[PDB]
Ligand binder design. Structure first.
Ligand SMILES: Nc1ncnc2c1ncn2[C@@H]1O[C@H](COP(=O)(O)OP(=O)(O)NP(=O)(O)O)[C@@H](O)[C@H]1O
Ligand SMILES: Nc1ncnc2c1ncn2[C@@H]1O[C@H](COP(=O)(O)OP(=O)(O)NP(=O)(O)O)[C@@H](O)[C@H]1O
Ligand SMILES: CC(C)(C)OC(=O)NCCCC[C@H](N)C(=O)O
Ligand SMILES: CC(C)(C)OC(=O)NCCCC[C@H](N)C(=O)O
Ligand SMILES: [Mg+2]
Ligand SMILES: [Mg+2]
Ligand SMILES: [Mg+2]
Ligand SMILES: [Mg+2]
Lengths: 257, 257
């Protein structure tokens, strides 16, 4: 008669935001099953593009058109970069690092590599230097509703001329308005782009003391966004896992049919 | 008078395939330096796209237009997948795995995830099932002229109808001809796509015994290509490192100016 918690969980997996009690579990499940196969079949026939990939390409076109240089840096970076990022056994991050071998780890952020690119490009390109990168990042997490251990990050930044908070907020605003994501900006000067109680991004207006360790000596602005969180808001997924790289979902549809 | 080996190495770093002795090192280096800044400045003004990223997008459009489903699976996979891929302490791969924690490792290939997608999608999509994925892979290597420890792989495959060697070679041929890469196909049936003595890809025509461990029971074809190797051939880089994710090069130009 009444659906068990476990049965409800299974139904929620097959449930899509677009869908609209009483009937038995087997009926409800068969209904949802035929629907997802249908959605999957539609993707396969018409678009065939992966949400995460499609988003990355959409973000790339956005910044490339706005004068930012597309960067693809190593995902596997030296542990030494962590220490130099000011990540000591005093911050939360220190306990979220996935170590590899004895000298490396999985980048928990894009900052270090972008820092290097800013210093190096400054010697070859005209002010201001504008770069961005979209790629995998890794952190050990306790949560699983707004956090993934393997997520995708977007970090763009400008160094030199025009690096003001107003300009930064202008970029943030044009970006999210372009993607159709509702947000509110709240807040070296630091800002947080929020959607409800979900943190979409953290932005900072430099210069900041840490800049010196990386050979940076000019003002700059920048923000980092989690692609899965943007996907979560846009497609209204209730759980961040439906947007993550995985073998359990495809464009938010359960592959366990 | 004569350039030292070390000076030659430095010049080669700044050297591009398009360029055309006697003069002193400082002169030669200053000449090359102004040239690279120029190239970099041109990229920044006109295109702004990263080679590796641009290639991925070009590969994606290719297969998407040809009916293949774009997949983005986890880069950090379970070690159990390695064992199930038939990778024992009998093969070379067993010694090339980058372990993470006690139960995970960095995917040294895309096979396991794609295997799962084939089994699952088979229950929802019409035959044949066509999928592909482009993403980072990791292997410990002794070489550094044709091997990277962090490289990018493309693996496409079709399961069900039309899975013949002829069709496989046809896909391979249209693909490389599209990218403008010279090659020769040589060779469960297995093929190697070569460029000189450089292995561009390994393709296999199933079914193969390993299929059973993953719940696969239909014929299939597929090939895996290294994106950095394709870039190496296309842009004529002498060293694979100029195409790799890095902080030392950008679209093959040295960032150490
Ligand atoms: N574990 C994660 N899973 C998914 N996205 C993440 C994760 N960690 C960070 N992000 C995204 O990356 C953005 C910038 O990173 P960062 O500012 O370090 O996040 P945080 O401050 O760790 N956020 P949070 O853990 O939710 O309090 C965050 O605002 C998120 O959009
Ligand atoms: N270490 C690497 N660096 C760059 N590309 C690689 C690397 N390993 C494999 N690839 C690419 O991935 C393709 C398919 O993988 P695989 O067939 O396992 O390579 P392999 O057989 O290990 N090739 P090789 O190591 O040169 O003899 C190879 O043909 C290369 O194009
Ligand atoms: C200075 C630092 C590391 C905080 O930020 C950068 O160097 N670059 C981009 C910053 C993006 C905001 C925030 N640092 C993030 O992790 O997303
Ligand atoms: C069966 C197996 C694992 C060898 O291949 C696949 O399951 N899928 C794609 C194969 C691509 C060729 C080769 N396996 C490679 O690693 O590129
Ligand atoms: Mg956190
Ligand atoms: Mg934050
Ligand atoms: Mg090998
Ligand atoms: Mg091979």
């Amino acid at each position: 008669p009444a659906l068990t918690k476990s049965q409800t969980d299974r139904l929620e997996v097959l449930l899509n935001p677009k869908d609209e009690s009483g009937k038995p579990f087997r009926e409800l499940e068969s209904e949802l099953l035929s629907r997802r196969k249908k959605d999957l079949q539609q993707i396969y026939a018409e678009e065939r593009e992966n949400y995460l990939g499609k988003l990355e390409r959409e973000i790339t076109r956005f910044f490339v058109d706005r004068g930012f240089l597309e960067i693809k840096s190593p995902i596997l970076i030296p542990l030494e970069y962590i220490e130099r990022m000011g990540i000591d056994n005093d911050t939360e991050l220190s306990k979220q690092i996935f170590r590899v071998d004895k000298n490396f780890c999985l980048r928990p952020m894009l900052a270090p590599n972008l820092y290097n690119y800013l210093r190096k490009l400054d010697r070859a390109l005209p002010d201001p230097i504008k770069i961005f990168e979209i790629g995998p990042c890794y952190r050990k997490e306790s949560d699983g509703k707004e956090h993934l251990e393997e997520f995708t990050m977007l970090n763009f930044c400008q160094m030199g001329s025009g690096c003001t908070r107003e300009n930064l907020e202008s970029i943030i605003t044009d970006f999210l308005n372009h993607l159709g994501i509702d947000f509110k900006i709240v807040g070296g000067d630091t800002l947080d782009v929020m959607h409800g109680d979900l943190e979409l991004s953290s932005a900072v207006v430099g210069p900041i003391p840490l800049d010196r360790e990386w050979g940076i000596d000019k003002p700059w602005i920048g923000a980092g966004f989690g692609l899965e969180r943007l996907l979560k808001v846009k497609h209204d997924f209730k759980n961040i896992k439906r947007a993550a790289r995985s073998g359990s979902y495809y464009n938010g549809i359960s592959t366990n049919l």
